[PDB]
Design an enzyme around this catalytic site. Structure first.
Site, PDB file in Angstrom:
ATOM      1  N   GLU A   1      63.829  69.208   2.312  1.00 36.88           N
ATOM      2  CA  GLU A   1      62.587  68.845   1.760  1.00 36.88           C
ATOM      3  C   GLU A   1      61.657  69.567   1.277  1.00 36.88           C
ATOM      4  OE1 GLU A   1      62.034  64.155   2.178  1.00 36.88           O
ATOM      5  OE2 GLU A   1      61.620  65.659   0.833  1.00 36.88           O
ATOM      6  N   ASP A   2      62.143  70.115   0.116  1.00 41.50           N
ATOM      7  CA  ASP A   2      61.475  71.048  -0.785  1.00 41.50           C
ATOM      8  C   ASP A   2      60.932  72.183  -0.124  1.00 41.50           C
ATOM      9  OD1 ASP A   2      61.941  69.062  -2.737  1.00 41.50           O
ATOM     10  OD2 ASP A   2      60.090  67.916  -1.972  1.00 41.50           O
ATOM     11  N   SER A   3      61.737  73.139   0.638  1.00 38.73           N
ATOM     12  CA  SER A   3      61.490  74.200   1.368  1.00 38.73           C
ATOM     13  C   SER A   3      62.577  75.237   1.115  1.00 38.73           C
ATOM     14  CB  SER A   3      61.240  74.098   2.922  1.00 38.73           C
ATOM     15  OG  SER A   3      60.821  75.073   3.358  1.00 38.73           O
TER      16      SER A   3
END
Ligand code: MG
Ligand code: ZN
Ligand code: ZN
Ligand code: ZN
Ligand code: ZN
Lengths: 1131, 67, 206, 404, 115, 51, 46
Positions: free
Chosen positions: A759-761
């Site tokens: 999730e966007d990490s």
């Protein structure tokens, strides 16, 4: 002679480089300011009327010439010295130059006793100077000279320094003036409305808007009305025509209808005639106008005079404000009515509000001119009062004492300092957002802020039409760069080769049209206008012509030869409607294009040859424009242009699309702006991703400017090891991203590894971070000054003492010196003191007012600067230095909208490795790609692998058919790698191969300003606000987090009543009041003596204690302030 | 601003190769051949030398604080 | 007085490799040393003192790191490859510092990592099928592969286990590569020995 | 503590958590509990509130704790499910040909909190002991729940013919007595829809057992994905030459069809349909042709994908993406619309100065006949930027009205 | 602000045991070895050596949290054997293997430098 | 209806696959700043004296 | 006690006492910088 396709990609970019060698990226700002100083100030001073004052003797005081010296600074001794911009930045001065005006005062009393006294160079004000302009001390200096002055040679300039703060004027959009625009409002009494914001050539008043509308159907037919300025009632058009001296209906329709063979126009104008028959002479019509006005004179004489003055001055000033211009005004108002009828008859399209051909960009020059007109008018007013109070006594006066120069100086300084564009008194009618603080976070942010445009539609407006990317923004505004918050589509950015016109006088064009076969408008008969072509110049219908085609040929030849017509003049021939509109005014956004012959470019190979040796034979862009090979085309002239996207379009094809092109793109990638021109392969991303990167390139760390060692900026981030991208576009060569890059090439692996990048990490390499990977330094400047404002109380820098100072915190002051200032190299932790300042009292005779560090920083003092501010007390700036090593929570981004925070950091032995022991610097999750469709990220990774293995820099220019994925894959397969960029990786923990071959390679990543350490915050019983005893607001104030209405609603849905009461009563503002059980009003309690009494009821026994929020007590008291009786009845 | 000491990825020393790299480039080597002459065979170290921007040379155009 | 701040220089000095061959086994961790902050039994003193007086830029390199111990010196300074560049100085700029070098390993900081890349591989022909190539023909062959060019990967070995691991241990300079491997084996063996000692104490204490 | 994210839209935006103190300076969240908060890790910040009394603590522990918040009353289904890596990986893990060795199985069983310590009998005993991914997920599945679902790739004509109870594609999820008897798990089985395994676990087993079920799926599957791995690259965006030729033939035929409709309209050989003007009928015909072209090309790209394609992997599992995204990356980006219509004539009877006047062709009016891997042409780039600006404006303008 | 010192991954805190043995009650003849300040480097080798023992029924390890610096190794053996004895023998076997590997690498280096 | 409150904290969120769904990983600085008023009893007298 | 400062323009070491206008004695420049402290600041080379 012809440039062949194989050479084209060089030739075009050679041409582009020449452009940026000539102009730069902030040319619009500098040219605007230069025109304002060279022309606008002088025009404003001369356009002011001479102030004739007399009791007898009389004085005129005519201002005739201006002189703007170079920027200087006056010390307390008064010695003028040349002030350098860096000295202004450091000392919090204003980089301004003095404006002196020549004044001529002639004494005239009687008997031809005349004598003139001229005051040469009367100091009229101080004008702030745009950096790198002609009137800047950094003008024409070499890079060595700028470095000698502690200036960055890459600094573009284009901004002002007001009180040490770099301020940038944002270009403001506005509807163009002197042009008739026929719209149709769906919800209004009028079916069609033709407006014209009219403004004289040299501005002296606001835009006088005139409307000519048609009443919506439902007396008998559709009536045409005219909403004149300064008149609060609609006026029939026929009445206006008669008031201008055209009483016969034949004359009026001669002026309105140019083709008497057309009964449709006739019957549609007939209702207006039928409505105006009782009024049939000029004086009666003028009386009607005056009566409909908001100041109806009881006597018709002054009514008629007022109507005369309105119809001569406020109605259509651009047509002419002098007398005997009624013929021109009648012709123009008839043209407005004609345009309205053409729209109502469907013969013309309604005008598009969003068309940029209908808009103008109000730049630094024309904005400073608006300020200067207002301020010079106020100055002349003050001079009038001062001189009047002296001549009323019958004696001479000194104009030097009449001129209070603070008007112009403080006005310009205030307006540029705050951004409130207008008089300081009208601080709410003034429009803010002009003149923002220049963004110095990275070089791209500075360039983009200097190329920023603004649509002042209002962020509150929820109509999407002005926010939409109009078709006409092509080549003028970046399609991608725009804020994604509440100002989508309103704040815009120039495209790279976009040039905003600076303005020019129409006099040579009008003179040539006179010498040419044009016929003036007063000399013709209206019968000729039918077949003839109208000629408008800056909105004014000046005449008519018989062969518009060869007129346009002549004018285009003249503009391409740099003859009387300058390059920025727009010349649009509308053919279906026979207008020829010529524009010379400022604010017209245009762009350069390659002219095309029959089906060939005029840019032959000889031009490319001379451009290649640009540095020897001084053959520049201007020689390319003067050769008639390049042309600036504005948005409105693009409508009449047939563009070729590339010279390949000019080839004869099996089926010819056009075969009659007139221009060609220099390169399509120039439709992008500064921040979108850094995206590699932006045509392989979803467009929202390109917009998000264009926003995120501005928060990326790098080296924002070369001379950062001398700047005392409030906040500054410098990356330890900036790298130029391995995969670059050919536009960054002009953005100077290669000289001041804002990222690092990271070996990024797109993989699912341990789940810490979901999730966007991202997962970063701890070993790489140990080696200086994405390490930065954060510089924070604190300013302080000791004020000796009066003998009542004076501040002073000195090491405080526990025995004399009163408000002295428990923090130790040992790090300070006897001068009260900390020394460089001293390590300072949170809450520490850097400046020891003490203020004399009226813990005796001095109180501690020291400057602490912003809490929880823990830096080292980088340097300390001491000087004197403008007024001249001691002034200190302390720059503290804090090394920011990337960590979990720091935000990173690629150039494709792929942002994410560091989830975890693994050491090199914990990261996955290739057969040759390469570990990824970053690991990002594959799930960030599919929905986003950032294929440019993958192509950039593959191109970067090829570039690193080949020893080159990849070409990721957007529209390049010589570079596709198959070529890059074939190249990569030559270096012993899987052609698609995959590799077998091994698990770092176990060493086993990963079943799925991972996609890994160099990608340019950016470290963004948003570090977690600047965001983490906690509170447990800290300070509270004064008014309502609730926690403060902000990290800096040690404030509490807001438990808002939506949180209240969520906890109500949960049913958590005690938690809700804890959050909204006990953790915010618990309080107690004493209430009278009879009247329910808060009583008087005395808990020390235990005496509780209500003065209202005169009781002291029936009082009750009530536990309520302090905000509720404050509410009830503010209601009692309003005579409301909120009675808290406990029974 | 200055050539890193180690390669961020592997930890190979690249600090002693910037000057040699520039000397090879003025010797009419291609960047790839220059990187091959210095022994940078992994594309991470080639990234380090090939993408470096020597900003310190521009910071040395300013006179120091003390003479 | 250089254009790089103090932490920049310090970080940059930490990453200079120092010859550690025979001295690293003798020195102690400052945790284990019974001395004050420093002593010659747990640390090595370096001094650097450079001043640019001449007109050309002065390259402060690792050659300017002067040590008290002749055995522990910068690798590039050892008696070709140029010296690591610490900072460039302009006329009038000056850098004078005093460093101490300590014993550590890569778990604490990558500057104590002796390797400049550890290539590790096994089963070059994908016989164990620990990888699954969607298109095995598209992949280049390992340098350790023994396959004719028509054959893309080895026939699958159901009874196979990873054996025959190939290593290429590149040294940053501090240790010799064979010293890195020998010290690695000794360190892993002492980790296991300490673990067994603590295991025996836990078993007997129960 | 109560953990909150703004905007607090529903009751699941503030849930109770148990504190776990950890080294660095961020709030560390489980990945299943990100969907209730609408939270991703692109710089989002969240608010922690600490109740300050035993009464409020008991209130939050008995009302607002996350396991009590698994099923939402809004739509009587789970609000949190299995998410990106764990969902792609559980899809890959429960495929029929996933065989785990003894050491791998013990590694995965180390990450089961609810494990009775008994190694299950492997599904294959000879020639070599091998456990299956379904055999380990059966250990993850709690209690004795029973569930029937269907994998997203389940053919619709399989439940009619033979092989209904022995699926050739290993679709038709069947869990019996808490053992995954068959089927590939995906969004439909572990997501937030009604009747999924997580929902049935919450309804049959308590909220505590379901909490452990979420945690065990995530831990076991992530540690297996350390072996399997998941990625995406250029090779997943590429199609074979046959697919490219089919897509280009489809687009060429579609453009010729639009040219034919244009020629009909120009010759007055087009008559309007009931309920529309001639302009609207022409627009309907052109848009139908181009939508048909987009769908046909997308189907061509979808069928071209292999079983190893990572786009297809993430779409099949439902972790991220859709078939339209694959079509736009591989086949064709398609028609760009502004306000639900083709690109408007913003110039005078033109969309751009590069076109002739009165050009209603597909490329003139904003049909992107390229894919994202192919790359957009300049006019396609500008039209696509226009279409994307429409979405940005919608996202930024709807918020105020919806919040009010 | 919140960065732990890098030595905390390797160094034992005062009063913290390097290894702790806890009887697993779910199944007989099983133990949990919680080893502090170690990571996959020793966990993987100890597990894989324990898997070579036919008297070991289960051998696994986990790092419960990467930010924490301990491992847990679960070992189950046959009833006639012990998980503590299995763990001891695994460490002894690893030590002997590494000693032999070190001596053979010394011999190989000597051969390579000599000829 | 809404107000600022004590005993609140805010920071960036980060993934952690090794937390249960009902856990939140908190920094030691937020936890050292934030406090919970625990009542003393003979059941917790020793532990609270230790703290 | 002396608090010697450096000139921003002439780089001259000159002593200035409190309650004194900030002026370099060699060239009159108005911006001065403090010298690096003599205190001992330590850096872990990390
Ligand atoms: Mg987010
Ligand atoms: Zn009362
Ligand atoms: Zn490397
Ligand atoms: Zn010692
Ligand atoms: Zn001086």
């Amino acid at each position: 002679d012809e440039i062949t396709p194989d050479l084209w990609q060089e030739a075009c970019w050679i041409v582009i480089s020449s452009y940026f060698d000539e102009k730069g990226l902030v040319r619009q700002q500098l040219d605007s300011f230069d025109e304002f100083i060279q022309m606008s100030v002088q025009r404003i001073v001369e356009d002011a009327p001479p102030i004739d004052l007399q009791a007898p003797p009389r004085y005129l005081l005519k201002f005739e010439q201006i002189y703007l010296s170079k920027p200087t600074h006056w010390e307390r001794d008064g010695a003028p010295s040349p002030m350098m911009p860096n000295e202004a930045r450091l000392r919090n001065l204003t980089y301004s130059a003095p404006l002196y005006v020549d004044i001529t005062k002639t004494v005239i009393k009687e008997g031809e006793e005349q004598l003139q006294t001229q005051h040469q160079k009367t100091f009229i004000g101080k004008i702030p100077i745009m950096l790198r302009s002609t009137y800047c001390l950094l003008n024409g200096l070499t890079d060595r000279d700028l470095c000698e002055l502690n200036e960055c040679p890459l600094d573009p300039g284009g901004y002002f320094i007001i009180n040490g703060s770099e301020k940038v004027l944002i270009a403001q959009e506005k509807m163009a003036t002197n042009t008739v625009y026929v719209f149709a409002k769906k919800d209004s009494k009028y079916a069609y409305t033709g407006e014209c914001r009219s403004c004289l050539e040299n501005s002296s008043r606001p835009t006088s808007t005139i409307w000519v509308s048609m009443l919506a159907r439902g007396a008998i037919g559709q009536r045409i009305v005219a909403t004149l300025p300064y008149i609060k009632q609609e006026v029939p058009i026929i009445i206006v025509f008669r008031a201008l001296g055209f009483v016969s209906d034949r004359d009026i329709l001669e002026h309105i209808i140019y083709d008497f063979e057309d009964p449709e126009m006739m019957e549609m104008v007939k209702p207006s005639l039928d409505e105006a028959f009782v009024i049939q002479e000029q004086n009666v019509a003028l009386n009607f106008i005056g009566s409909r006005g908001a100041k109806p004179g009881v006597t018709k004489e002054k009514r008629i005079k007022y109507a005369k003055e309105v119809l001569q001055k406020e109605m259509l000033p651009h047509v002419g404000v002098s007398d005997f211009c009624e013929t021109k005004k009648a012709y123009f108002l008839g043209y407005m009515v004609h345009r309205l009828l053409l729209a109502a008859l469907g013969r013309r399209e309604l005008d598009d509000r969003d068309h940029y051909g209908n808009k103008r960009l109000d730049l630094a020059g024309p904005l400073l001119a608006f300020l200067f007109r207002g301020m010079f008018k106020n100055l002349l007013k003050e001079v009038r009062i001062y001189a009047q109070k002296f001549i009323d006594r019958g004696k001479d006066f000194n104009l030097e004492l009449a001129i209070k120069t603070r008007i112009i100086s403080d006005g310009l300084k205030y307006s540029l300092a705050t951004g409130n564009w207008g008089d300081q008194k009208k601080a709410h009618q003034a429009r803010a957002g002009v003149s923002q603080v220049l963004n110095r976070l990275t070089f791209a942010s500075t360039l983009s802020h200097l190329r920023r445009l603004n649509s002042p539609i209002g962020r509150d407006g929820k109509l999407a039409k002005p926010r939409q990317l109009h078709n006409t923004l092509w080549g003028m505004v970046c399609p991608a760069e725009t804020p994604e918050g509440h100002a989508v589509g309103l704040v815009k950015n120039l495209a790279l080769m976009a040039y905003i016109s600076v303005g020019s006088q129409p006099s040579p064009i009008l003179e040539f049209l006179e010498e040419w076969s044009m016929e003036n408008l007063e000399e013709i008969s209206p019968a000729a206008i039918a077949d003839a072509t109208k000629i408008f110049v800056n909105g004014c219908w000046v005449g008519i012509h018989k062969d518009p085609e060869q007129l346009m040929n002549t004018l285009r030849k003249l503009r391409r030869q740099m003859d009387i017509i300058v390059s920025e003049v727009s010349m649009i021939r509308d053919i279906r409607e026979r207008e020829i509109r010529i524009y010379t005014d400022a604010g017209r956004i245009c762009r350069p294009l390659l002219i095309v012959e029959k089906q060939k470019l005029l840019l032959k190979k000889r031009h490319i040859d001379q451009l290649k040796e640009r540095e020897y034979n001084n053959y520049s862009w201007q020689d390319l424009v003067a050769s008639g090979v390049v042309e600036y085309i504005d948005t409105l002239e693009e409508e009449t242009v047939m563009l070729a996207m590339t010279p390949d379009d000019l080839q004869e094809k099996e089926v010819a699309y056009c075969s009659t092109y007139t221009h060609c793109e220099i390169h399509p990638s120039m439709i992008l702006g500064v921040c979108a021109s850094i995206i590699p392969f932006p045509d392989h991303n979803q467009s929202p991703r390109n917009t998000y990167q264009s926003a995120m390139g501005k928060q990326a760390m790098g080296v924002y400017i070369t001379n950062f060692h001398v700047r005392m900026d409030t906040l500054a981030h410098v990356l330890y090891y900036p790298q130029k991208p391995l995969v670059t576009t050919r536009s960054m060569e002009y953005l100077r991203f290669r000289e001041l890059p804002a990222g690092i090439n990271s070996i990024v692996a797109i993989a699912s590894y341990t789940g810490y990048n979901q999730e966007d990490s991202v997962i970063m390499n701890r070993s790489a971070v140990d080696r200086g990977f994405f390490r930065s330094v954060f510089y924070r400047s604190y300013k302080e000054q000791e004020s000796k404002k009066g003998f009542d109380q004076e501040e002073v820098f000195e090491k405080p003492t526990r025995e004399t100072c009163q408000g002295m915190r428990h923090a130790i002051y040992d790090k300070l010196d006897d001068d009260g200032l900390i020394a460089p190299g001293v390590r300072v932790s949170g809450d520490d003191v850097i400046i020891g300042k003490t203020v004399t009292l009226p813990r005796y005779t001095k109180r501690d007012c020291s400057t602490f560090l912003r809490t929880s920083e823990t830096g080292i003092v980088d340097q300390v600067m001491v000087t004197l501010n403008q007024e001249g007390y001691k002034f200190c700036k302390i720059r503290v230095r804090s090394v920011r090593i990337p960590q979990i929570g720091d935000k990173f981004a690629s150039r494709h909208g792929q942002k994410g925070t560091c989830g975890i950091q693994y050491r090199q032995e914990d990261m996955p490795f290739t057969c040759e022991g390469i570990t990824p610097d970053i690991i990002i999750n594959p799930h960030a790609i599919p929905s986003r469709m950032t294929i440019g990220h993958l192509i950039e990774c593959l191109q970067g692998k090829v570039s690193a293995n080949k020893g080159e820099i990849g070409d990721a220019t957007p529209f390049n058919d010589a570079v596709n994925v198959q070529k890059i894959s074939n190249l990569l397969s030559d270096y012993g790698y899987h052609l698609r960029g995959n590799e077998v990786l091994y698990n770092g923990f176990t060493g086993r191969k990963i079943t799925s071959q991972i996609f890994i390679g160099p990608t340019y990543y950016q470290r963004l300003k948003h570090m977690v350490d600047d965001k983490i915050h906690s509170r447990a019983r800290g300070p509270i606000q004064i008014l309502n005893r609730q926690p403060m607001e902000g990290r800096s104030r040690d404030g509490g987090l807001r438990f808002g209405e939506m949180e209240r609603d969520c906890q109500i849905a949960h049913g958590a009543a005690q938690f809700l009461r804890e959050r909204l009563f006990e953790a915010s503002d618990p309080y107690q009041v004493h209430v009278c059980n009879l009247c329910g009003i808060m009583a008087i309690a005395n808990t020390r003596t235990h005496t509780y009494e209500c003065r209202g009821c005169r009781n002291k026994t029936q009082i009750s204690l009530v536990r309520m929020p302090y905000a509720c007590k404050l509410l009830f008291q503010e209601l009692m302030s309003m005579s409301i009786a909120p009675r808290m009845m406990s029974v | 601003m200055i050539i890193p000491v180690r390669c961020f990825t592997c930890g190979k020393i690249v600090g002693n190769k910037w000057e040699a790299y520039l000397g090879l480039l003025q010797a009419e080597y291609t960047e790839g051949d220059a990187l091959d002459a210095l022994g940078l065979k992994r594309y991470c170290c080639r990234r380090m030398l090939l993408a470096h921007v020597d900003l310190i040379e521009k910071l040395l155009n300013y006179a120091p604080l003390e003479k | 007085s250089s254009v790089l701040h103090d932490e920049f220089i310090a970080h940059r000095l930490g990453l200079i490799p120092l010859t550690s061959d025979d001295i690293v086994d003798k020195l102690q961790y400052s945790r284990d040393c019974t001395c004050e902050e420093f002593c010659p039994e747990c640390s090595v003193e370096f001094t650097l003192d450079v001043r640019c007086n001449e007109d050309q830029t002065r390259h402060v390199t690792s050659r300017d790191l002067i040590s008290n111990s002749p055995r522990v010196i910068p690798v590039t300074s050892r008696n070709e490859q140029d010296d690591i560049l610490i900072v460039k100085l302009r006329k009038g700029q000056e850098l004078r510092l005093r460093a101490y070098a300590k014993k550590g390993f890569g778990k604490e900081h990558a500057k104590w990592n002796p390797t400049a890349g550890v290539a590790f591989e096994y089963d070059p022909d994908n016989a164990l099928r620990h990888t699954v190539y969607p298109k095995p023909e598209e992949w280049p062959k390992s340098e350790y592969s023994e396959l004719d060019e028509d054959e893309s990967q080895a026939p699958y070995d159901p009874n196979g286990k990873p054996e025959r691991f190939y290593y290429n241990v590149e040294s940053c300079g501090s240790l010799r590569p064979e010293t890195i491997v020998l010290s690695a084996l000794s360190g892993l063996k002492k980790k296991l020995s300490d673990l067994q000692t603590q295991l025996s104490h836990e078993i007997q204490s129960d | 503590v109560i953990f909150n994210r703004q905007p607090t839209l529903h009751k699941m935006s503030m849930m109770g958590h148990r504190v776990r103190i950890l080294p660095w300076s961020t709030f560390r969240l489980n990945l299943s509990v990100t969907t209730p908060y609408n939270a991703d890790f692109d710089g989002d910040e969240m608010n922690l509130h600490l109740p300050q009394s035993l009464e409020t603590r008991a209130e939050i522990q008995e009302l607002a704790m996350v396991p009590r918040m698994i099923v939402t009353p809004q739509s009587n289904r789970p609000v949190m499910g299995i998410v990106q890596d764990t969902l792609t990986a559980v899809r890959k893990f429960t495929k029929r040909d996933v065989f785990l060795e003894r050491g791998e199985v013990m590694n995965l069983l180390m990450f089961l909190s609810t494990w009775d310590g008994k190694v299950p009998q492997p599904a294959i005993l000879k020639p070599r002991p091998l456990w299956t991914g379904k055999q380990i997920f059966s250990l993850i599945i709690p209690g004795h729940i029973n569930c029937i679902r269907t994998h997203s790739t389940h053919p619709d004509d399989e439940d009619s013919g033979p092989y209904k109870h022995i699926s050739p594609g290993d679709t038709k999820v069947v869990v019996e007595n808490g053992e995954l008897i068959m089927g590939i798990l995906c969004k439909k089985s572990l997501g937030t829809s009604a009747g999924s395994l997580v929902h049935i676990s919450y309804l049959e087993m308590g909220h505590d057992i379901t909490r452990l079920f979420y945690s065990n799926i995530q831990t076991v599957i992530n540690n297996w994905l350390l072996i399997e791995g998941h990625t995406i690259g250029i090779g997943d965006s590429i199609a074979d030459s046959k697919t490219y030729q089919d897509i280009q033939n489809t687009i060429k035929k579609a453009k010729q069809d639009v040219i034919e409709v244009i020629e009909k309209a120009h010759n007055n050989e087009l008559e309007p349909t009931p309920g529309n003007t001639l302009r609207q009928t022409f627009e309907n015909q052109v848009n139908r042709i181009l939508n048909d072209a987009r769908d046909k090309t997308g189907s061509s790209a979808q069928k071209s994908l292999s079983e190893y394609n990572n786009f297809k992997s993430m779409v099949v599992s439902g972790a991220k993406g859709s078939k339209i995204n694959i079509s736009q990356v591989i086949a064709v980006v398609g028609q760009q619309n502004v306000e639900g219509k083709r690109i408007p004539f913003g110039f005078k009877h033109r969309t751009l100065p590069h076109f002739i006047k009165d050009d209603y062709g597909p490329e003139s009016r904003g049909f992107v006949e390229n894919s994202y891997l192919a790359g957009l042409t300049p006019t396609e780039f500008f039209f696509h930027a226009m279409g994307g600006r429409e979405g940005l404006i919608d996202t930024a303008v709807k918020t105020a009205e919806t919040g009010y | 602000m919140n960065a732990p010192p890098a030595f905390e991954s390797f160094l034992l805190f005062e009063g913290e045991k390097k290894i702790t043995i806890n009887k697993d009650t779910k199944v007989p003849n099983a133990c949990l070895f919680t080893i502090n300040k170690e990571d996959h480097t020793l966990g993987n080798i100890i597990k894989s050596q324990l898997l070579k023992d036919p008297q070991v029924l289960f051998a696994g390890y986990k790092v419960p949290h990467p930010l924490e610096h301990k491992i847990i190794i679960r070992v189950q053996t046959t009833p006639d054997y012990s998980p503590q004895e299995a763990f001891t023998n695994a460490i002894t076997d690893l030590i002997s293997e590494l000693s032999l590997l070190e001596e053979r690498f010394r011999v190989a280096i000597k051969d390579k430098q000599e000829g | 209806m809404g107000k600022r409150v004590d005993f609140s904290a805010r920071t960036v969120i980060t993934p952690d696959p090794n937390l249960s769904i009902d856990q939140v990983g908190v920094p030691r600085s937020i936890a050292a700043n934030m406090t919970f008023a625990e009542i003393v009893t003979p059941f917790n007298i020793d532990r609270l004296q230790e703290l | 006690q002396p608090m010697i400062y450096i000139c921003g323009e002439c780089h001259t070491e000159n002593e200035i006492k409190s309650r004194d206008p900030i002026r370099c004695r060699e060239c009159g420049y108005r911006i001065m910088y403090k010298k690096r402290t003599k205190r001992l600041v330590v850096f872990d080379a990390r």
